Amino acid sequence: MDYQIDLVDPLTKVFADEVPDAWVVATQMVLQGEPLVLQLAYQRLRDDDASFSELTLATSLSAQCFEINQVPSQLPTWPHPDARYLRTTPGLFPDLLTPLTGPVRAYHGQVRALWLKIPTESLTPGSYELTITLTETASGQVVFSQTVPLTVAAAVAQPPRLHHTEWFSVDCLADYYHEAPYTPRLWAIIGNFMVFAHDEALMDTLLTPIFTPPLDTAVGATRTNVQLVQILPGTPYRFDWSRLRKWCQLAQQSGFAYLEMPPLFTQWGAQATPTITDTAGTALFGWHVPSTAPAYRAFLQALLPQLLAVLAEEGYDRDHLFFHLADEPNASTEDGYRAARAQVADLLDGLQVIDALSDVRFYENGLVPHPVVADDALAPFLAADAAPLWTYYCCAQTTAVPNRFFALRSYDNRVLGVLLYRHQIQGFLHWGFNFYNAQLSTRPIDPFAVTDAGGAFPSGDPFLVYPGADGQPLNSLRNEVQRLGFGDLAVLQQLEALKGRPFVERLIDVTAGMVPQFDDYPPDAGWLTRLHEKAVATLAAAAP
Amino acid sequence: MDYQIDLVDPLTKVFADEVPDAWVVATQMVLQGEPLVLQLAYQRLRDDDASFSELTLATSLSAQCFEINQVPSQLPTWPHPDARYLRTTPGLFPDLLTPLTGPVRAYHGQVRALWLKIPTESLTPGSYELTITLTETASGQVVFSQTVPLTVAAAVAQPPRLHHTEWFSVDCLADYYHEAPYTPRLWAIIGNFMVFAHDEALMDTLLTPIFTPPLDTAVGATRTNVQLVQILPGTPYRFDWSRLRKWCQLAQQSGFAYLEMPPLFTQWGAQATPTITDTAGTALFGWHVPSTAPAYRAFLQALLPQLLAVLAEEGYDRDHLFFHLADEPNASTEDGYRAARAQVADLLDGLQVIDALSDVRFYENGLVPHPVVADDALAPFLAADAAPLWTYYCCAQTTAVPNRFFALRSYDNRVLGVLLYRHQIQGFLHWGFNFYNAQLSTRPIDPFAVTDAGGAFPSGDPFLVYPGADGQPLNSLRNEVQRLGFGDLAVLQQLEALKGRPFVERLIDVTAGMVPQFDDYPPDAGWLTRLHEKAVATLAAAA
Amino acid sequence: DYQIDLVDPLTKVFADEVPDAWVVATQMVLQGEPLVLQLAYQRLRDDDASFSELTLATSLSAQCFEINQVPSQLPTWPHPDARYLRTTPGLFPDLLTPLTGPVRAYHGQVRALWLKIPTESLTPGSYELTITLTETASGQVVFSQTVPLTVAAAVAQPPRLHHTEWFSVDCLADYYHEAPYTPRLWAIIGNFMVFAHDEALMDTLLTPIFTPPLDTAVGATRTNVQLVQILPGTPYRFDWSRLRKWCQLAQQSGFAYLEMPPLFTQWGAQATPTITDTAGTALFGWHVPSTAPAYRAFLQALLPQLLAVLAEEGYDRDHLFFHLADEPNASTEDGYRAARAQVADLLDGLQVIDALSDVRFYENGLVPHPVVADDALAPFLAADAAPLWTYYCCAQTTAVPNRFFALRSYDNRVLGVLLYRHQIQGFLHWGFNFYNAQLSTRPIDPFAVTDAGGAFPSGDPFLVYPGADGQPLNSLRNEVQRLGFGDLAVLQQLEALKGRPFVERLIDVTAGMVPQFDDYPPDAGWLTRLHEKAVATLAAAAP
């Protein structure tokens, strides 16, 4: 009666001021390598003179444990929020994950939660009993004990097949951690952020600042310079490659199979050029030099043969590279995109060139052969059978479709996985791995205090990871939930290897009661848990 | 149509969550020098496709204007909150003030507020007409206009008389801005904070780190070293005053009349000494050297004559200095205070030594002749007619008494001023000007994200000011409200100059309906406004 | 032009203040349970008319009331705690009047409506309730709001609890100018009896067998309301016609229990009730001691005969409550013994109840069935006393539930969950309709004087007001207590489904603590959540 401690659904968001639903315990089954994921909520009902009481966690198998931290939001939603959104007004939302490194503090008058992962690659197949205990460190009384049966199947977890890039901001690390591009300490921090990106965020593709990306910048303004290709004073062009080389050695070592090149013109119109300097610091391109400048055709004609040469030397052939022209064109800016392409189409021969888009006309016009499409605009590109096809979401995908905002359900994030599968999407892109700026980079923000880009974007949009004091990225609930969805993709793919694709499509549709669509998926979240278990049971029932 | 915009009482806290009540415009009267202070709440009612619509602010007279910023709290109260507390669970609280440097953004679905002050120091006496307007930047249409009459008496606002110290942490600036003690950029930042403290927090007294203060430190741990007195290696003690000369020059140029020295012994038990090193970096004193160490007694017999001489050269004589023995002894540590006392008492003859208590018993013993007394513990000291008397408040003053927590009313902050007056308290001390650490300084915290010392202290306790990115302090609502309380104390002091004390005491009591006490003051704030008005009208009429 | 908003049912809307809005959320009710909303309104447009007229419509049948501002000159007793909303003489929202025409929206003042949507006749499902206000000059719509409503298939069961609010016939006599007992007085008594059972949720009625010895100055006489009449002369003959009348209206109005008045005088039990014969000659009263052998002989005659008449009216020994005298302390204890000893043998077999705040006198067996003040329950709960009742009155000013105009509506409704949590079998209040000054020195006008002539906090003495047509008018204090009772009912309905432990567990978890009578959560939202959870669980188990 002194404590209220309970396991909860991993898709619940635990708010400090409401008691959540208990998970009813049932036997679990995981492929060997697949972790078991639980969430545990807790408060101290005893009304004594101390604000909290210390508790000791124990597990009968090795686990990895996080505290879930409440973080502020001043703009949880954009206008006209639909009925999926949990809350709507400025408040606190759960998101940040800090490692558990001592006793847990159970507070009176408010609820808190832990994130628990039980790794399984060391476990010989068979049946287990997982006991979780909390002990009042002051008295040695055991206040919580819960046993969860865990079967580890003979079948090994395969990883998912999908291209995944979450845009990377080197300037945001420079500014936050107070380090000139590119000190040794900055290189160490970038390293840490890259290992997280590959291993924990399940990225195979990485944005590489060949020059400072012409992205999220105010007309006329300037992000901290992060160009990896450096250029000596002088008009016959001579390149210094040392930073690119070091960059690629760290990506390779961090596990990246692909690098993604920044856009060659400016966002939303392709009107100007990226802010490029020489080694003295003298601007050569920028907002004052239009896209159609002859000087910039000449700059690139020189650069592109040599740059591919350097990238191949570092283990990235033309089949392991993605290029961009300009980001997020629509009908208004059709002819800007056209005009800029015309300056450069003949230089990008045989390269894979992609761009993020909503308007199918750009694909039929052939301006954009390889489109990344908004997840509320997919239907016209499915009609036309475009392959390959990628998807993305951002501030603007507010209605009916998947997204990761603080004020939405975790289910709206996780449900991406099955939907990538069901509709044969090959890639997923997102602009905000680590954007710690106000809209249009007018100034830096503190990501622990501001999650809404300075009151411009719904919270949860601009960054997936927080910058730890030690230079190490801190995990988020949004990322751990995105992982569950990627683990859904991967078991469905593994199931398709054993049976039809037809078989898996029938099984998704029957478990949903419908063909799940990106803008129309079931209102209840329980069907995902049931698809995932069925998939896992069919692969186990069939293993040697 | 379209917007919803109203003036609100200065003592209202506007949540992003709720519409507050409108101030009914009355004529204001100010003595000359005294600012008019207003608050303005705002919201866009039109449900378009933009989240917000920019507005422009104009005033008839020069205003300093601030946007009021919502800040997170994970621990709004300690156990068993009384019913004065506004909210009692984790959420956002209005506290941080940022200069308004452009248009204001009126959002749909959420309320926001500005703090406005109209200086009066340059208006010649008379009747003015303060008009406040907001214009929609898109449509050039005016969507808010209110006019507040303002009278400026020929009578001049005199400043409050009272010792006030709010403990300063150099280690917290060093760590937040990532500057080693003591670089040129750290000196400039310290200066910025020192000028806010005097002019904007109304302090006359500054905590001066002769050595790193033995405060809020876990047994056996260490904060960044900020000691102003440097010791050269070797046993006939040679000292380097350079850091301390610089400190005192910035202190004096910022207007501080008094400096406060840190405790000579460790907090609570008084068991050990402060962490002092030499120029090579070698530990001379600390947790591993007891208070009763002959060496430490020797060190202070060398240090105290030489430091007094140097402070006097910086223009702080023995009657402008406060000294500390050990913070916060209680019944069970009483002997440790005695033992430490008896090592150094002979070296402190003719110095003003003070320490902070809740137990009256250390006063009854003569152990602490000059007590700083918790504001929920005053009654036995008032009765034992102790004088001089200072008071303080911290985490541990949760019930029935003045404090500044995010979750208490602004009233509970502002009332402090009349109560100092009424009960003849001579000083006010607070431990948290700018503590940007977790409890016991086990690590630094982000003061914009964490306001409760890592979930140990009710939010609004550990710091008064925030660290701006330019290196300048950012103001708080808590400070602005407490400045109103000092404004109350000032006019009542000025009124007692004209009539006696009995006259003023009598006006307080009749206006309140009762003799107001620290643990028993009227339920509604209105009476503070009426007494402020009464005392101003009377003073103006005498000019 | 207008400013119109749904507000929380627990909000008190003052004329001089805009209250916070209710964010619409899907409402779930059991079938039979009503949806209750409050609606605040004002005109912003500043024309030359003081008000403009509006028409209300609702897509479902609604029962609607205007909330009326009523005066108080004594809002609190001394030393009020911080829960008290206002504490000086003003106007307070309380009286409820049927809405018979259009709403008048005024400039410079806020007003409110109380809205109830019955549900007994909706078949289960999802509904959309639309609420609209339409300016009548201009035929346009100035407010529209849809609130979603699910009516479960699971049926709302009534609360289990004994509840009496003491009834004063003399106050109906005096106010409507009717001598006991005329045809028109009987009809007005019935109107009040019907409200009592059906609208105030009483199962028990105080029956004036003789004029109740309550609220009477020593040596005085309230109007004679005795239903039992006594022919003149010493071999005692009784006339039952007024009793039979009383009992029939009581039974037709739905009362299962009748409550007999105290046998001895208040505060000491020194003397006897003011009893006359039919000539008018006084047989008992202030002039006859309680030890008088005549009073015992009067009751040995009366009691067997009254029990027989009451059983004819359908009220047996298990459906009657008897009183002796209230509040034995160290003073009165000696004469309460004296008096008790004079009659105890006649009362064996009968349920005898009395007010008691000292547990010694329960243990003693001096008072077997105690009605305990809600600020004194701890020692009785410590002794597992059972059955146990509670009351509150002028004297329960601090930390505990009450009804006062100046308290939060929260502090009234919260009683429901606390009665459940602590297994309290019954609730008694003294003031159903006391329209007199203290000690019954004179009648008062209940629309103009709400504090018994400046004696008791306003909201204490009566729950209903007297309508011009001789029908009771409702009050907000009554509507809010009906919420509290609705909470108790769902919690009891849920205990039939799970057990008590499960329901205690949900109470404590939702509250974040074990709620006590003198220590319940700071904020009221936890009640709304608790009520929602209970209802969702009962709906889910229906087949």
Residue numbers in the entry:
A (entry chain D): 1 to 544
B (entry chain C): 1 to 543
C (entry chain B): 2 to 544
Paper quotes:
Beta-N-acetylgalactosaminidases (β-NGAs) hydrolyze the different β-GalNAc linkages of various glycans to modulate the length, combination, and abundance of glycans. The overall structure of these enzymes is similar to that of CpNga123 and BvGH123, which consist of a β-sandwich domain at the N-terminus and a (β/α)8-barrel domain encompassing the catalytic region. Among Groups 1–4 and GH123, the DE motif is located at the same position, suggesting that these enzymes adopt the substrate-assisted catalysis reported for GH123 MR-β-NGAs.
In Group 4, NgaBf, NgaBl, and NgaLy were only active on GalNAc-β-pNP, highlighting their strict MR-β-NGA functionality. The structure of NgaDssm (Group 3) bore a striking resemblance to that of NgaLy and NgaP2 (Group 4) (root-mean-square distance of Cα atoms [rmsd] = 1.5–2.3 Å), while the structures of NgaLy and NgaP2 are identical (rmsd = 1.0 Å). Among the conserved amino acids, D95, W115, Y466, and R478 (amino acid numbers of NgaLy) are located at the interface between the N-terminal domain and DUF4091 (right). D95 and W115, located at the N-terminal domain, fit into the surface pocket of DUF4091, and the side chain of D95 formed hydrogen bonds with Y466 and R478 located at DUF4091. Therefore, D95, W115, Y466, and R478 are potentially important for maintaining structural integrity as they link the N-terminal and (β/α)8-barrel domains (blue letter). The DE motif (D327 and E328), Y392, and W431 are located around the substrate and are involved in substrate recognition (red letter). The Y392A and W431A mutants were purified as soluble enzymes (red letter), although their catalytic activity was considerably reduced. Metal ions generally did not affect enzyme activity, except that of NgaLy, which was inhibited by Ni2+, Co2+, and Zn2+.
